[PDB]
Every structure is written in C-alpha cells, then in structure tokens.
Design a protein around this ligand. Structure first.
Ligand SMILES: Cc1cc2nc3c(=O)[nH]c(=O)nc-3n(C[C@H](O)[C@H](O)[C@H](O)COP(=O)(O)O)c2cc1C
Length: 169
C-alpha cells in the first residue's frame, strides 16, 4: 500500500474535498484516501503513517461512519504508527464544540497506541471550547469551510510541510 493512509468520513463532502487537497500536497503517490463508510478497522493496519479526517456534527458528535468504527478501534494496535488529524467544523455556529471530533478520535487512537503528530496553532480561529485542545494547540489541522474557506488551501500547504517533517517523509 502507499505510504500514508488517510481515513475520512463525510456528509456534505467538505472533509473529502480537504482530504483530496491534502493528498495533492503530499503528492498523489504518497497518500491513499479511504472513505470510512467503505472501510474496515483492519485497513488501518496497512499503513505506518495515518491521517484521520472527520467533521464534527450534530453538536459535538462524530460523523456516523467514524462513530461506527470508533466502537471497533479496540481491535487495532496502533503502536509503532504516527497519526495526524484534520477536522472540518464551523467555529461561529458551534463555538462550544469546535472540532470536537478530532479530539475524540485522537484520545481513543492514542490510547490504542497511535502517536500523535501535527499539532496546530489556534491563532486565526474564534471559538469558545473544543475537545481538540492539547496545551493550547489543536490536536490537528482545523479547517472551517463554512466561514474560512479562503484559508483552507494555504493551511493545508503549511500543515503538510509540517507533517513531512514530523513523519520523516
Ligand atoms: C447539524 C449540524 C451540526 C454541526 N455541528 C458542529 C459542531 O458541533 N462543531 C463543529 O466544529 N462544526 C459543526 N458543524 C459544521 C460541520 O462540521 C461543517 O459544516 C463540515 O465542513 C461539514 O463537513 P462534511 O461536508 O465533510 O460533512 C455542524 C454542521 C451541521 C449541518
């Protein structure tokens, strides 16, 4: 399999659009996209580097497909793997639950052995609370296509450059 496995869930396609851009930034040959509606938890075993994408929905909840796989994460050993996270959200409409989903996923995957890389600054965002906070930084890249779609491309560019360094790729 390719070097990096990017597993994402999506309802209206924004998380998928972001996933495609992330793939392009790394290079089409480095990343393989996996929509978790079609994935099995065991597919995560095929990669030494993982990128987890998920929108926060219905006020602080995981996207449905990730919700389903979450329950089976206990069946996977992430030890030895480096994992990064990106989330889509709306900081204005859900200021108290901005990017909660990636925080929820990282908490579980880290417990299962996955080492987190890709922490992201909170500068440039206006929100009140988030389960994705770790020492003042988001556990991963935060995109907001509802209010800051004009910032997404450059944010991904910067984040991918960071991940190449942290992944050692
Ligand atoms: C009913 C509903 C609830 C939402 N709840 C949250 C939330 O709690 N936190 C957040 O950051 N974004 C929230 N959002 C915003 C979505 O995460 C955002 O629009 C995202 O880009 C959608 O991605 P998708 O197109 O991949 O589904 C919500 C959107 C809808 C329509």
């Amino acid at each position: 399999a390719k070097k990096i496995g990017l597993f994402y869930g999506t309802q209206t396609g924004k998380t998928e659009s972001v996933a495609e851009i992330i793939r392009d930034e790394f290079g089409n040959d480095v990343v393989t996209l996996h929509d978790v509606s079609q994935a099995e938890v065991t597919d995560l075993n095929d990669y030494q580097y993982l990128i987890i994408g998920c929108p926060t929905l219905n006020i602080g909840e995981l996207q449905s497909d990730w919700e389903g796989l979450y329950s089976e994460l206990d069946d996977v050993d992430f030890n030895g793997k480096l994992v990064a996270y990106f989330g889509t959200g709306d900081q204005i409409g859900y200021a108290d639950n901005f990017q909660d989903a990636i925080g929820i996923l990282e908490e579980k995957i880290s417990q299962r052995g996955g080492k987190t890389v890709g922490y992201w600054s909170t500068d440039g965002y206006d929100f009140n609370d988030s389960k994705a906070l770790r020492n003042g930084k988001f556990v991963g890249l935060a995109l907001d296509e509802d209010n800051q779609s004009d910032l997404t491309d450059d944010r991904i560019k910067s984040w991918v450059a960071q991940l190449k360094s942290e992944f050692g790729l």
